[PDB]
Amino acid sequence: LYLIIYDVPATKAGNKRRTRLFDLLSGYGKWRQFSVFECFLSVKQFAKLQTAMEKLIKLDEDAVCIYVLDENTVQRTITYGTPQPEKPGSII
Amino acid sequence: LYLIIYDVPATKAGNKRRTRLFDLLSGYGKWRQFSVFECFLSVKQFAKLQTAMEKLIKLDEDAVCIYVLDENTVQRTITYGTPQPEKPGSII
Amino acid sequence: STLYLTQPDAVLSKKHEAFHVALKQEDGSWKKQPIPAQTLEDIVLLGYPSITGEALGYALELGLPVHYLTQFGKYVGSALPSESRNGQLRLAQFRAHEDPIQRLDIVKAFVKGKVHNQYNLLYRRGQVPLKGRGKLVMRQQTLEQVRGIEGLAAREYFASWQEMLGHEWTFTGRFRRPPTDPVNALLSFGYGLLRTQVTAAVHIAGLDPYIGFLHETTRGQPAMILDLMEEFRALVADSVVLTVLKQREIQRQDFTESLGAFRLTDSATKTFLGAFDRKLSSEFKHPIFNYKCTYRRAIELQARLLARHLQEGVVYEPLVIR
Amino acid sequence: STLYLTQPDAVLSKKHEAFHVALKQEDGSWKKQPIPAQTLEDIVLLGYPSITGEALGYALELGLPVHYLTQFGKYVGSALPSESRNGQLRLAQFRAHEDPIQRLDIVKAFVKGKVHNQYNLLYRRGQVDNPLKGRGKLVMRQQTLEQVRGIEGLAAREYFASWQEMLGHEWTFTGRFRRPPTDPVNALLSFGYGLLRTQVTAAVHIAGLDPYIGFLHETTRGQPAMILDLMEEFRALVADSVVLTVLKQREIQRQDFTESLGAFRLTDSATKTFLGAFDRKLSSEFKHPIFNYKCTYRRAIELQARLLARHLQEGVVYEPLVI
Amino acid sequence: MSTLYLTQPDAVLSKKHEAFHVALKQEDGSWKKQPIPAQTLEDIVLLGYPSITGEALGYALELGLPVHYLTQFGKYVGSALPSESRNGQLRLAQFRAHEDPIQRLDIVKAFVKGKVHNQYNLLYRRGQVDNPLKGRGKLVMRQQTLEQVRGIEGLAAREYFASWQEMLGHEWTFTGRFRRPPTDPVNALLSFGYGLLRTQVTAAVHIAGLDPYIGFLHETTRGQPAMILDLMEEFRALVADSVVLTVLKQREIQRQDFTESLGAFRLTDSATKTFLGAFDRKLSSEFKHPIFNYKCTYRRAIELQARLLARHLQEGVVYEPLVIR
Amino acid sequence: STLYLTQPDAVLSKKHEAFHVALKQSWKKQPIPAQTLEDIVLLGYPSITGEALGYALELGLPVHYLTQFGKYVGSALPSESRNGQLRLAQFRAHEDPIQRLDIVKAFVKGKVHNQYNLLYRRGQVDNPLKGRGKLVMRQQTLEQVRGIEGLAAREYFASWQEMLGHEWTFTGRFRRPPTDPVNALLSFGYGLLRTQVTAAVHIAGLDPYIGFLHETTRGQPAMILDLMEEFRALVADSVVLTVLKQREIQRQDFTFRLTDSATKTFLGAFDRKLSSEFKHFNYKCTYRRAIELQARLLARHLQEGVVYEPLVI
DNA sequence: TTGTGCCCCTGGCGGTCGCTTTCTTT
DNA sequence: GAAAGCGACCGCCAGGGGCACATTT
């Protein structure tokens, strides 16, 4: 999976960007933790996100991180409290 | 190379778990984001740390995942406002 | 990927680049939930739930069709994204429909692709009628005969089923719109939401649904899907009910209210769709390559193959399985 | 016969068997207007209203489209039902594309309409009343396509060259230069034809036609030829007229941008006030010929597309909307 | 494997429940108590005698983190080593074969047979045409007494040190090596190298359970260890010597030295932090292991040679030391 | 001639060419000169200036870190120090039955005379052994001797029945599993002495895992288990009988574990005992220090040939 | 001038609930 | 009715300030 992390200040000009980035990542992936999103997607859908990022972030005072776990290195991940990684057809 | 996250409530009986989990992971790895550590290390270090981590949590109230990222997967963690992972010896 | 949605009181609002669906369980009843676009490939609306008008303006810009359906699973209609611009294609699709010497040579293949799959599904499930009928199609000389032939093979397919289903249910006679039997209604379920994955594929291949080849287009129903759905009617619409009736949903469900109706209950839709994605999320190895052409792809692949067939004179080899 | 909703604040709902509209606010205690079925076979949500799914589910069980558009008329989507007679419509749309008699007798209609609106326009903007004097029937008495396209492309020249006299001095004009505009006027025209394109496109989608199969404009390069065929008889009155109107009280040289790569673009202000006229112009038309009174241009487009649907489905006549 | 180095002689290494906290600032603020991970270390080296906590030594040794102690220059003074081994039978062999001269010979004649070839297979790389140690190598085995071999090792050390001026350059002068404190400027640097080679060699003996004080070359009659040096000897030409001319060629050519209280040409702070970098860089070089295809960092090579000698003392292995051409 | 620190409330420093032990929480500076010292023992957990940790290591002095009870955590050793001849003599002796045997006799003499003097302390009836001490000396091999300590052990343990009563049963000594309450108290004490002895060993330089009496296997710290004999009857076997008269009753023992409350009252007797002694040449002593001493006297028995007469009362 | 917790309260993060302005664009 | 744009009540994150502690087969 594509693990995304943002830790942006508590200033009322950055909270805009933090919550906006939250609303974005809620469109590409699953919320896992307060500052961790799990996006399972292809590259066509990843460029649409990186271009939406570079147009949004002030990397002189922001803090972002990304990790690229391909499928057969996610089977190894261990968890204790939260559920398992999954990207199937969704129903409700 | 390993990576650790946690999500813990604000109970005075749970905040202790956090402030001890940081005081633990410090000895076992580096630090990138608030709820996050990146810990490049070996296995028996894990059998000494995991056996300490299973040893201080109740699962009904805490959340933690463990992401395993060996060299080839670590290489691409494209970021914008942070230096990327590594682990040398240190001179002071 | 694909997203099925049930509760009719679910306002599906649109936030910055996602959709929030609102559910109502009794505590104050506005419980909401985020849902990501940019990852779906199509929507399916079983009930008649709500849609914020400003959300079609999002689902119709990523290629997400909005397929409307009913509790029973009876297809009604859909909303689709930007249209196709291959008019040159829909001209050949038509000149080959008014040239019957071509239309016949196509329907022969459309059927050869169904009867072989039927007999091979029988040997796949354990049996051995349809051996000497797939060959009595190419030796025809017109179309009315072919339609009678399909009716024959279908009245043999539905009455040769008893030997494998079991004593739990009974299948004697079949009617299309009235759901007399449960299975005869589970067909209305499958036969309805297979068009969901077809009608979009045709839209991708710039094909016209109304202009028919086997079905005569003078009924008011798209005569291209109901001819294309035939090849997979016996693969995904059928093989799913026969593998969700293997220790799943045998009985204890399917309320019999409103005599003349066998509706499902809840907890059976939410499982039937899971088995559906089991079908459209598996690989069958497809002779071209050792491993290729996911099931859901196969439909879009057939549509583009027919497009080429109408512009590049390629063969149209239907999908035969063993 | 069509449940329009131009207001964005309305909501439809099924009241025990039939639709019921609530305009201009709150579901509760404000501005109800009930309306039944039995004349409804088309629902047009012009703006972005809300709708309860229980309404569509009803509609889609009897062949009732739901066309979602924008408050201006732009097309964003349509929800089409299963049972629809649009088959014969498409088959005729093609049988006319492959039978030059129908194609020709329909192209003659478009050309006749365009040049008639042009003549009636140049007298509308009373100029001298000697622009062309009689290019209309000169078409009908021909029996070919090439000899009609020559007339189109010659009337265009002999029509656009009669403009500098009518605009005056502050603006120059030599002819119609398509994208990229070498002039400001060509820019306004290529920008107004696109708004007319949105409206037509919407009409072509409701009518059920295949917009990419045409009669005059050859179908190639993915051209919505079926849209241009219907534009030809509206350009002169809605676009070529709105341009003339704004250039006598509204926009002047101050606005249009410099020659970046030569193309003359518009300002961030006019692009919002230009619609000041391009929203009222399509809110008009009290139907000069005593045929009727109630109508609108924005709606006459839907009409003409449907009249073509009938010319094909039902062998009806197709008379272009003139003046 | 992530060695630690400290050089500010006013700091404190406190403990927080699993880890260390270093403090430097010294009252321009709140001491800048910066964190440090302890469970990932393999060793700790100190130079300025920094004040360390008492409660932290114990934890460092509960894990396997040996503590060391050097001076500002880098001279060796002492170390605190962790829990020792248990194979006292090995140590008894270390000695049982230490007082039978007929075996002590056959061992030191390998220690030196893999110490002079290791010098020549470094010179030939540096670019020395002849500098003839190849002969002393062949003349080792002929010898049949330890007093016929210590002289050869000293002679070869001097043949290897007299071939320095032409190798170094015209800048520094190395006419000879003095037993007294670093009168020679270049010689003030090997005491650093040859000083903090014991830092990595005084623990590889403690990993195989080898008794440091009982060795085969150096007479253990002066309170000086014998294995810590005898074993550190082979690696005086290739991990603590190639470091010198590796750094004296690209780096620290001059301008980073001083002199006081005896002349006593010393080194400089802010140049150590580059030297130690060079040392951890040399240690972490791979070198592919000319016996099999091990491909192991020197850092291990030492820890290995220790166990190989131990097995030689228990399992009669052949002692194949290191040589690289 | 060694510098001890029994309090973690202290600080060591090097002030103008001599040591400075700032103790009493700032309160009680007391400078000390060097060149008389040969060893330092930081018993508690003090803080120590690195400036001093050089002046002690560039000089010929180690520094042994311990805890207030005596457990061994670590030791800082210098580069130059004479422990080579010591280790060499120790090994030469392990393989020379003359020295080894005449030293094993020392340990056994100590043990049996301490047992007899314990039963004289508790005044059993004055019939425990009555002459086992010399019989050993009348032997000339090891097996003979090693067979006397077990006889003395049975004679010394079976005599506790009348000594204790019925409140606590006893017939013999059984190691892991304790099999009884008192055998478990013993194992615990017999072992807790192992820490002071482990330190006392590393303080003198000996190799614990190589010894004389207890043959070396499984890394059996033979050099410890040898020095432990002469105390097995004087500290632990005395502490137990010192608390089994007043405080510890069957209550405190599970089933055979012990409750947390007894694991802390036991030490109130252990450390307390370890803070007292008379001598015998009258010498101020605390049992803890005598262990370091016996170790140094053994090192001198191997280096200088000094006689090693063990401790008795 | 040496750790290990157990408070408050000052403080740079993290997201939701509840509130005035927008809507129409080759 | 619907989107996006703000401006505050409470579940997560950490360094900092004091003041109870300290023995162990």
Side-chain angles (χ1 to χ4, degrees), chain A residues 51-66:
Chain A
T51 58
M53 275 175 159
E54 301 191 13
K55 221 181 295 176
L56 195 147
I57 312 181
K58 292 292 183 299
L59 55 96
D60 51 348
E61 66 176 3
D62 287 322
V64 190
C65 200
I66 305 179

Side-chain angles (χ1 to χ4, degrees), chain C residues 48-49 53-54 56 60 68 76-79 83-85 87-88 90-91 94-95 98 195 208 210-211 217 220 222, chain D residues 48 53-54 57 60-61 68 76-84 90-91 94-95 97-98 205 210 212-213 219 222:
Chain C
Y48 295 141
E54 314 201 3
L56 253 53
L60 283 50
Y68 299 120
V76 304
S78 309
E83 205 158 358
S84 184
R85 20 201 158 181
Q88 300 265 104
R90 301 195 285 283
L91 265 63
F94 166 55
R95 316 191 211 167
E98 299 204 348
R195 297 179 48 172
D208 197 354
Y210 312 99
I211 316 186
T217 173
Chain D
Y48 268 108
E54 189 63 35
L60 279 60
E61 290 171 355
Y68 273 92
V76 304
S78 59
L80 263 68
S82 187
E83 296 154 359
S84 178
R90 300 287 189 81
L91 298 171
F94 298 174
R95 289 168 180 180
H97 181 89
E98 274 81 356
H205 275 76
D210 187 350
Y212 304 81
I213 304 307
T219 182

Side-chain angles (χ1 to χ4, degrees), chain D residues 54-231:
Chain D
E54 189 63 35
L56 270 48
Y58 196 43
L60 279 60
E61 290 171 355
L62 52 147
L64 264 56
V66 156
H67 295 284
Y68 273 92
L69 286 66
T70 67
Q71 199 166 351
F72 188 82
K74 188 179 185 297
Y75 181 73
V76 304
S78 59
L80 263 68
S82 187
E83 296 154 359
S84 178
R85 69 182 172 273
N86 302 354
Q88 306 159 32
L89 167 57
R90 300 287 189 81
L91 298 171
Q93 191 179 358
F94 298 174
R95 289 168 180 180
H97 181 89
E98 274 81 356
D99 206 75
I101 298 163
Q102 294 178 310
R103 181 189 207 163
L104 176 65
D105 292 322
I106 294 152
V107 160
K108 280 175 187 176
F110 300 132
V111 168
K112 176 170 127 56
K114 188 173 179 181
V115 57
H116 282 181
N117 295 11
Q118 289 177 357
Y119 183 91
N120 290 279
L121 169 64
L122 303 189
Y123 160 59
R124 193 183 76 104
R125 299 324 214 174
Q127 174 84 349
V128 170
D129 198 359
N130 294 330
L132 52 93
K133 274 181 67 269
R135 305 232 189 274
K137 192 165 147 186
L138 213 80
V139 175
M140 199 68 61
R141 296 147 58 244
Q142 311 210 79
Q143 309 191 344
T144 43
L145 259 175
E146 180 188 6
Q147 308 186 343
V148 171
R149 283 167 177 170
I151 297 289
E152 180 187 21
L154 281 169
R157 305 170 67 85
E158 293 167 341
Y159 167 42
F160 288 112
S162 53
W163 281 52
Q164 272 266 83
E165 200 286 346
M166 195 172 58
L167 301 93
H169 312 319
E170 305 180 11
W171 302 277
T172 63
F173 206 106
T174 57
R176 174 56 175 169
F177 280 8
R178 304 300 321 238
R179 83 195 64 77
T182 311
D183 279 317
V185 196
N186 280 268
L188 281 77
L189 269 57
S190 300
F191 182 76
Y193 295 1
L195 325 182
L196 178 57
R197 186 209 196 84
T198 56
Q199 301 304 318
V200 178
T201 318
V204 191
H205 275 76
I206 309 181
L209 307 173
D210 187 350
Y212 304 81
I213 304 307
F215 302 105
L216 163 55
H217 283 99
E218 282 294 339
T219 182
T220 172
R221 277 159 42 83
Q223 263 183 350
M226 184 58 57
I227 294 180
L228 314 170
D229 283 359
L230 278 49
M231 285 190 190

Side-chain angles (χ1 to χ4, degrees), chain A residues 20 23-24 26-29 40-41 45 48 87-92, chain C residues 1-4 6 16-18 21 33 35-39 273 277:
Chain A
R20 178 68 187 74
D23 298 324
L24 199 175
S26 292
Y28 284 90
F40 201 95
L41 39 66
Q45 303 163 5
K48 295 176 183 176
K87 66 294 174 185
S90 303
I91 310 165
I92 34 174
Chain C
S1 291
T2 300
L3 162 56
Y4 306 87
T6 79
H16 285 254
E17 32 264 38
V21 58
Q33 173 186 348
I35 300 294
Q38 319 314 84
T39 72
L273 318 187
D277 277 354

